[PDB]
Amino acid sequence: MLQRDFITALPEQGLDHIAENILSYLDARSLCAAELVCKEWQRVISEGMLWKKLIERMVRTDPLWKGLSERRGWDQYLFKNRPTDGPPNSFYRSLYPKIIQDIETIESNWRCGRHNLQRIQCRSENSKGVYCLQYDDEKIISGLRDNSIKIWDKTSLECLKVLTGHTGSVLCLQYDERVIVTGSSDSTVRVWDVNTGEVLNTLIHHNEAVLHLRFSNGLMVTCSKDRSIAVWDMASATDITLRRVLVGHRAAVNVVDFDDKYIVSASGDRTIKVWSTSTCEFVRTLNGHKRGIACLQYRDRLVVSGSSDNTIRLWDIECGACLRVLEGHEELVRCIRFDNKRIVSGAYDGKIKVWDLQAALDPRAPASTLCLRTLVEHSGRVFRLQFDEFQIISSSHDDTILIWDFLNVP
Template structure:
């Protein structure tokens, strides 16, 4: 059936303020029971006695103007006793204050709070006790910690939690939390690795505020702090950079434990990103009970064991960052001023440190291992090299327990870190000075003034292992017919085993001394005095990329699989997109040679996707500017060559390359990104 145009009903003008057309914003000023306006005089005549007034008002009050209803309500309230007004307020409370924590399941509440930033989470903490207890959930703060781009070594956390729980059994702490009936029906919402939340209890029963506070727990699960309510830090204890919650002129909270409880930086590998390392379990004058009462550890009701307090860890890391930015730090020197005789006798050429040790190599042909806490030598200097110690790397982990040094005498020494024993000497590893050494759990890589890079295995290798190489070909000058019998030889058992620190690879291609190298997985990145950066696939021993990087020799390099950062004798630090080799930033400011560089971009879990999207947007804007004639494409290559310093600008006239996987500047979590 069709309707003629003239027969169609004409549309009525829409009242934008009509309740029928108001947008739903979660709160409405309209009454709960609205009715259409009626003729008040006609309806008022139906009122026969004062007893009918309440029912009449209930039926016709919506027709009265809002101002009259307000005055009438206030006049009635003025005539009521306080107890009755309190009852009315109680009845109106569900309409005015909707507490989603009281009505929604626990996992949904935590999912909602998981979208908040730290500053918003602090505002939630200040709302009420129930919301405060919920925001102490350890999983919320663990997620926020990683979203800041900070790292943690999970194996160390597991190890220290095991040690702390071993102490808890000996001191009987905490007494109330060991009650097996405590919060038996309480639900626990757990944030899994993929971001979803799952319930670990069968039912959900909200405890009273007194119960939740007594256990020091989140109302939906294990506590995020082992402190009683009286010792809970104020909601503003997490200091936000450039936020109103920071006290003016106060960069350090004096109420926290001494520096023994502060998370320190640990460098697992020179040139890598510092990672937090847990503090010592017990100070020299500290009892086991005091260690368990530290705010670094929190009692988990569901697992009935101590767990790391991520809120405290987050708070301490924020304060460390704030102190660094405000210049609130102290310096110290090695050797200790009271023991100057422990120092080197000549210049120091190389060093590496972690949370507990610092190792230095010197022109005096020795290495010294220092205790970072006492600032004293751990043992007498390590001697053996016949030339200056130019490079070193160590790993104090008992599973590794290794120190490698390279010298101008062309030798490479492998030491046992814990004892200082010389384990192996690779004599004449190169024809000239060894300029850099790097190792991971599989290989040791060295570079030299002789323009080569050499690769040694750290573990015994059998045929088929990564780095073993192809089976040696056997040449038989007399042709023979071999009948197959269905049995193939096991070359892994028949071919010889390559013992540790056997030369398994040699990389050649640089035109000058190879000054620095970095190793990540199957990739080696090297820089040289020939002004080039080379990227190698070390198992195949092939160069996959050569990047003309600087105008003078390159002295140092950092590589995190997404970016390459180099420092050069041309006074510049440059950032390159690793997959494409394109330069995305050129930093100038030094007035002398750049000899060492350390870079950390503070990548967040989602930084890679965001960086690629931002890089595409920058490219699109560049091509738009070219099409609009804002940039001359004919002179584009020459103009880009003349752009000597771009610290990360995305302006089309200033970008130096397009097609990179990271935006200008290198991307990442810019909040805590650092290049030193």
């Protein structure tokens, strides 16, 4: 006997759960097929709660599914072991295609550039403009040319705090659960309590404007107009020691990123430089930009950079090869981020571009196909943006923060 109906045979053995485990591996399309094989298969899928289980597996893997679970509030039907109110299998079976529909209309919104736009006037004092920002579900924190940090309610767009202390423009910031960290034209880095807004530390070191910083896992890196990168052990907000100074660039170091392996610096001197995170020794230079580099992000093997030459470049950090040049911005590329699906760039002409990342990395793909959308709502240079599966938030010389919503569209 060369054939056995596993999904029937196991229940007949009293071993329903095993049959369920088998089906639990299937993707939606295959699971649908399995339902149609015969009544006993349908019965096992239905009573084994396989669609609830699948949706949970999508949420546990895909942050998009995670996101939607929260924003749509069908997360409240997931996990929680026992039924309780007991939404039946039929419900979760009905929901899966509605999530897929949801998802496709989101992608369509990005592609066709349908969005809800909300505009925060940061009502800056004399000096106008918003050089940096970071957000979460609850708030947007921003750094301004008037030397202030402003915190915005994410929902109401009200201003909740205004931190003052820097004697120059706030050029870069990053925050976590515990602190905000900022670099200013005044050459200081300041650590603030993310809640009380109390100054916890001030790093005196850079001789000139501090242009970028990043911290993670008890390590902080700063970089300055003084052409230096500083690497800090960051035990706590108050226990922050200078580990090494990397001097390397012939001009201002405008941006710095890193992970476990590599620190990545980019400069007005037209170079990206790679350094060992562990040894702080130089590794390799990534040259090719025809002009200064204003912005960069590093993740995995991929460095993406935006230049005064009006191009974006994609690099492999291991051989330092440029994989793709992206042309279309008519001015300097002043900020840039990416995830797995796309690149979002901002330029000095106040325009924001959205690029197919996977297409950019396919060397067969024409330039023709690479820019999905051009978003024109700023009336000044774009200094900073952050985005996720659902939105862009951008800040600008025009003294505005823009929320572009591709989920809650009208």
